[PDB]
Amino acid sequence: GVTTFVALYDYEARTEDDLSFKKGERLQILNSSEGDWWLAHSLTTGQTGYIPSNYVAPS
Numbered sequence: 001g002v003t004t005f006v007a008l009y010d011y012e013a014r015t016e017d018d019l020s021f022k023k024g025e026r027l028q029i030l031n032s033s034e035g036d037w038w039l040a041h042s043l044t045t046g047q048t049g050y051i052p053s054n055y056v057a058p059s
Contacts, residue, residue: 004028004043005056019049027056 005027013020018037021027025044032038037050 002028004059005040006059007055008057009055011052011055013049015050017049019047019051021045021047021051021055026059027051 007021007023007025007027010022011018011020019040019042021042021044025042027040027042027044030039030041030048032053036053038053039049040051040056041048
């Protein structure tokens with residue numbers, strides 16, 4: 001199947017490339033190779049961007 005994560009907290013983007021999301025959104029991780037900001041896609045909203053990885057939990 002598909003691995004997803006759940007947002008634990010709200011985040012409002014602090015850069016142009018960051019993804020804004022609310023607590024409880026379902027996220028898929030596209031790339032995690034650049035440190036503690038991961039490139040993610042929201043399955044909930046369809047938006048894409050960097051997220052702080054400490055804001056998510058495993059499904």
